[PDB]
Amino acid sequence: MIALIQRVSQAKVDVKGETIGKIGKGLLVLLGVEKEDNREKADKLAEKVLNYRIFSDENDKMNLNVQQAQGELLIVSQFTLAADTQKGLRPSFSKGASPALANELYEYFIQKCAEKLPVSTGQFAADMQVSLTNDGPVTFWLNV
Amino acid sequence: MIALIQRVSQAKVDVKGETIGKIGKGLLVLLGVEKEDNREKADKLAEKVLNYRIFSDENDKMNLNVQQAQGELLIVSQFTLAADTQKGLRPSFSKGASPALANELYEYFIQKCAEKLPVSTGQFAADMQVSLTNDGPVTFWLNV
Helix, strand or coil: CEEEEEEEEEEEEEECCEEEEEECCEEEEEEECECCCCHHHHHHHHHHHHHCCCEECCCCCEEECCCCCCCEEEEEECHHHHCECCCCCCCECCCECCHHHHHHHHHHHHHHHHCCCCEEECCCCCCEEEEEEEEEEEEEEEEC | CEEEEEEEEEEEEEECCEEEEEECCEEEEEEECECCCCHHHHHHHHHHHHHCCCEECCCCCEEECCCCCCCEEEEEECHHHHCECCCCCCCECCCECCHHHHHHHHHHHHHHHHCCCCEEECCCCCCEEEEEEEEEEEEEEEEC
16 A cells, blocks of 8 residues: 655645645645555554654654644545556556455545544545645655 | 656746746656666656656547647656655655755756756755646656
8 A cells, every 4th residue: 555645735636626625734645555455554554644754843854743743634546656657658557456445445544544633535536636735845655 | 766747737836935937737747866866867767757658638548648748847856755664654865866966867857858848847955835736636656
């Protein structure tokens, strides 16, 4: 499972011209579900995202996690993170989870993160226009 | 070398409240320079980014590259892509290129991409607020 995170000052997800989810300071979490993922990997990835040292403390050191920083997570399903992009010019998805498993673990990861922090979401399998301001920018590819 | 690309309808880079680079349809390219990178890897990564099948054709199939799609690239230096994030909760940068090499290959990659397409940029080693609308969203981690 992959959580590609971007530190943001604000972000939102629009579907067909309407905003369906938004956050202020926090992380935009693009979530990629792979074959072999399970609730256990989700629990571990949620913990990693929630506690990753990505925010500035009162001295500008990247020392705080999103909880300490009083932020939110905007969680959006992104099947392309699981792509293999090594050869050629077209992505391959052999490691991608089926839509059923991906939606399940996506909604589950959301639940697990919500245990500790306010989170908002996109919509699974909907065309989304995801707007954000990556502050830094700061971007980390986390995975389990 | 890493090019984390996001398909956008628009994007911009602000530095201290002023927009220093912006694009319309295209790709926001977060660029991570690693130790061992060189002009040759840059040439290969620029080609990959420029020709990757990431845009929709007249039928909604992900068949066009950014050149065919008449887009631009917004290239922004991002040292965090080269981080190791496997253990613990704090990133490590053993594979990160020195600021000197990273700035060199960053400006070089920009030159190579400009040979084929209009490109705009952020500023190396400046705190940047990078705003964008990821259309899809569509996100690929490309590397060489």
